Design an enzyme around this catalytic site. Structure first.
Site, short mmCIF file in Angstrom:
data_model
loop_
_atom_site.label_atom_id
_atom_site.label_comp_id
_atom_site.label_asym_id
_atom_site.label_seq_id
_atom_site.Cartn_x
_atom_site.Cartn_y
_atom_site.Cartn_z
N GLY A 52 0.73 -1.27 0.00
CA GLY A 52 0.00 0.00 0.00
C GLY A 52 0.76 1.33 0.00
CG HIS A 56 -7.73 -4.96 -2.33
ND1 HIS A 56 -8.87 -4.26 -2.68
CD2 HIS A 56 -7.44 -5.77 -3.38
CE1 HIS A 56 -9.26 -4.64 -3.89
NE2 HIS A 56 -8.41 -5.55 -4.33
CE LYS A 91 3.24 -0.77 8.71
NZ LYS A 91 1.98 -0.02 8.98
CG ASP A 136 -4.97 2.91 0.43
OD1 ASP A 136 -5.63 3.05 -0.62
OD2 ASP A 136 -3.87 2.30 0.45
#
Ligand code: 4K7
Length: 381
Positions: A19, A131, A38, A127
């Site tokens: 993302g 998903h 991440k 966002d």
């Protein structure tokens, strides 16, 4: 291959998801746990630090993906986050989770609860999409849950609110959430259409909820909530805490108790007053212009003797339901058979024959939203 930056370590060849600001998520380990890692780019450093600290400084919400630890080299940051089984896209499309005990409506309640926790911290997702909503690994007992995350795992267009196309408010996420609600209930449809046509339809406000039946009670409740969340005007969109109070999430018992609390509330009202005038404004359409003709014969026979009970009044219909609920034990046997199995079958009896009754009553009774008796059914202050 492996990369060891610290207590954190990960595998560059295994990418779990992408993302949001060039962030990339890899499979890895921290403190002998399997985690997702991440990689924060320098452009995202400031955003990260503020959100990590804000999340660290409050309690852990079960529906927000868990934060473990962070390590920093010169060129990046590395954040270890909870590892998840699948996304909401897979949950809806695959159908595999049907037997795993996580129901669609409870999944949306968790998604909304986690979103409300973020909004209470002054964090906006921006966002949000299927998903990004992840299904957790099984519990010790095999229980699974839904969790908000910034990254999705391995039709991404059309989830963005019209107004953005910078300090967005929570209302942007509510629009995205609204599309997610329809996506789950409709089992893969989107309100604004197929993936490539979504973003253009969002700007001119062309949406189709038609997977929801107009005369089906369950679908009418959902339609009333969803159309408010995806509303073009951001100020018409309810906050996540308002969404959690909508009848969409109520149990059958709670729906029947709402009708009772309403009936006891309007019993003494002026009937010219704004309350009853508001409730009666929907009028004949809700009751199909006579509610005595839409109920089965044993019930009809029983309340024919009762005086008043005007057939065109919503208040009278709610008054009849309240009275048959109170005397339920003492009613004739043939009457209890038509209703029965209280509260579940009793309330389904009326909501099935009057699909707009609860939706109409809920909008009309917002005038009492401030009152202490209706605090379970509304959010105020
Ligand atoms: C569980 C967790 C979440 C965030 C961090 C630290 N930040 C971080 O990883 N980012 C990744 C790249 C994009 C953002 C910028 C805006 N931000 C919105 C946002 C979206 C979704 C959620 Cl759940 C949250 Cl909390 C915030 C996400 C920052 C560490 C750990």
């Amino acid at each position: 291959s492996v990369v060891i930056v610290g207590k954190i370590s990960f595998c560059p060849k295994d990418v779990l998801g992408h993302g949001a600001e060039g962030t990339i998520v890899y499979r890895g380990m921290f403190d002998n746990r399997d985690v997702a890692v991440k990689r924060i780019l320098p452009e995202c450093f400031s955003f990260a630090d503020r959100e990590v600290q804000l999340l660290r400084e409050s309690d852990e919400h079960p529906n927000v993906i868990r934060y473990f630890c962070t390590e920093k080299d010169r060129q990046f940051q590395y954040i270890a986050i909870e590892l998840c089984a699948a996304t909401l896209q897979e949950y809806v499309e695959q159908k595999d989770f049907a037997h795993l005990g996580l129901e669609p409506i409870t999944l949306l309640q968790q998604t909304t609860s986690g979103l409300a926790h973020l909004h209470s911290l002054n964090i906006v997702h921006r966002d949000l999409k299927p998903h990004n909503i992840l299904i957790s690994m099984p519990n010790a007992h095999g229980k699974i849950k839904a969790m908000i995350s910034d990254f999705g795992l391995c039709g991404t267009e059309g989830w963005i609110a019209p107004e953005m196309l910078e300090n967005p408010t929570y209302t942007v996420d509510i629009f995205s959430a609204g599309c997610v609600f329809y996506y789950v209930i409709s089992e893969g449809s989107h309100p604004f259409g197929k993936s490539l046509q979504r973003q253009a339809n969002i700007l001119l406000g062309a949406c189709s909820l038609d997977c929801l039946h107009p005369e089906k009670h369950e679908d009418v409740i959902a339609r009333e909530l969803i159309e408010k969340m995806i509303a073009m005007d951001p100020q018409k969109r309810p906050s996540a805490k308002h969404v959690l109070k909508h009848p969409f999430f109520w149990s059958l018992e709670k729906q029947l108790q709402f009708f009772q609390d309403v009936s006891d509330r309007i019993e003494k009202e002026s009937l010219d007053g704004p309350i009853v005038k508001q409730l009666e404004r929907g009028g004949r359409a809700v009751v199909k212009m006579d509610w005595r003709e839409n109920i089965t014969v044993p019930l009809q026979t029983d309340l024919r003797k009762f005086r008043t009970y005007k057939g065109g009044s919503v208040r009278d219909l709610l008054r009849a339901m309240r009275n048959k609920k109170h005397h339920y034990r003492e009613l004739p046997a043939e009457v209890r058979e038509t209703l029965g199995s209280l509260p579940d079958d009793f309330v389904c009896y009326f909501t099935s024959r009057f699909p707009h009754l609860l939706a109409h009553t809920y909008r009309a009774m917002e005038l009492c939203s401030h009152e202490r008796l209706f605090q379970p059914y509304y959010f105020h202050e």
